[PDB]
């Protein structure tokens, strides 16, 4: 297959919903079609949206905004049904503008391939780290496919957000893993506080599991 690219007009980028939005029913997932490099001379952009080739009419197009570089950017947002997205339907965005010799079409859908359930394991701090002021709580998330996932940490009630998560790494068996690291003051760990790693993924039962870790 040969690469056929295009030259000197507006460009289009189509972005998927966030994983957490498709996976928790009360959240609102969105596909986003962004048009950049719109001139002042031909600023008007038209969007047509399709879900598996059938045109839909519920998309919210925003006003155009002039960028720092003096081009216009325009964004159209389409609300998706959770089940549509997870059943693999294709969302197409078609963009029309007078500086395009023809409309630009982009298509996006959920990652293909056989899903694999994540296995989620929490690991306490190394004995050798307890000599520091701050300690590291580890959540290992392995065996998952596709790579789309959300991992978050919580402490008692609330979200703990002094953590960082690695990207997904392709493992030797063709599934993915990642690690997430929560840093907490050693006193909070030694006083018996319960820390929980929450994971959301399409191949968990109810798209959710939670593992906790205490002293």
């Amino acid at each position: 297959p040969c690469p056929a690219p295009l030259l000197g007009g507006p460009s289009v980028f189509l972005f998927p919903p966030k994983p957490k939005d498709t996976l928790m029913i009360s959240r609102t997932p969105e596909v986003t079609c962004v048009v950049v490099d719109v001139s002042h001379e031909d600023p008007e952009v038209k969007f047509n949206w399709y879900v598996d080739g059938v045109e839909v009419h519920n998309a919210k197009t925003k006003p155009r905004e002039e960028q720092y570089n003096s081009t216009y950017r325009v964004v159209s947002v389409l609300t998706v049904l959770h089940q549509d997205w997870l059943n693999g339907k294709e969302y197409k965005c078609k963009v029309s503008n007078k500086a395009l010799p023809a409309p630009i079409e982009k298509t996006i859908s959920k990652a293909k391939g056989q899903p694999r359930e994540p296995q989620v394991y929490t690991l306490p701090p190394s004995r050798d780290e307890l000599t520091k002021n701050q300690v590291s709580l580890t959540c290992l998330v392995k065996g998952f496919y596709p790579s789309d996932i959300a991992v978050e940490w919580e402490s008692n009630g609330q979200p703990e957000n002094n953590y960082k998560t690695t990207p997904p790494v392709l493992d030797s068996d063709g599934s993915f893993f990642l690690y997430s690291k929560l840093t907490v003051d050693k006193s909070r760990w030694q006083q018996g506080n319960v820390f929980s790693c929450s994971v959301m993924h399409e191949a968990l039962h109810n798209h959710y599991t939670q593992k906790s870790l205490s002293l």
Partner: protein, 165 residues
């Protein structure tokens, strides 16, 4: 020495050019040409530089049979993808400002921006010249242009524009 002063004119009017540009120096019939004070052409009225190279830069002067040695013209031959050209760099309020984003060998240049003090002033899908009809004080500052040659992103060195009062 009781005569008039001759004058050098360039076509096109760009005093700053890229290598492989054509330049034509003209003198306003035995017309002599001077380049860095060395004599270049004995009689011809215009001096054609077909495919500019860095050594063509410098001071040009001329005289004719019945006129005195001209004031000098500095010609500057630059190396690179993009050169931002203007008829001059000092404008008074309400003067037109004409800027050209000139590519090496007139290569086609798409998604072009002219910037002023780091910020977008004008964008074009295909290369075009930037015309400001009426200069104000707000047009003063450093400018450059930039764009894509194929998929390669290229930009010109900066140039200073002063607006006078």
């Amino acid at each position: 020495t009781d005569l008039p002063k001759a004058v050098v004119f360039l076509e096109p009017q760009w005093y700053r050019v890229l290598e492989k540009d054509s330049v034509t120096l003209k003198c306003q019939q035995s017309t002599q040409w001077f380049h860095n004070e060395s004599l270049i052409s004995s009689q011809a009225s215009s001096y054609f530089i077909d495919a500019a190279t860095v050594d063509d830069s410098g001071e040009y002067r001329c005289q004719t049979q019945l006129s005195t040695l001209s004031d000098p013209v500095q010609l500057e031959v630059h190396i690179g993808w993009l050169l931002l050209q203007a008829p001059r760099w000092v404008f008074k309020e309400e003067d037109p400002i004409h800027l050209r984003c000139h590519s090496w060998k007139n290569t086609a240049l798409h998604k072009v921006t002219y910037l002023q003090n780091g910020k977008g002033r004008k964008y074009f899908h295909h290369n075009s010249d930037f015309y400001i009809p009426k200069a104000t004080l707000k047009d003063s500052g450093s400018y450059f242009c930039r764009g894509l040659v194929g998929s390669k992103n290229v930009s010109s060195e900066t140039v200073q524009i002063t607006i006078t009062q």
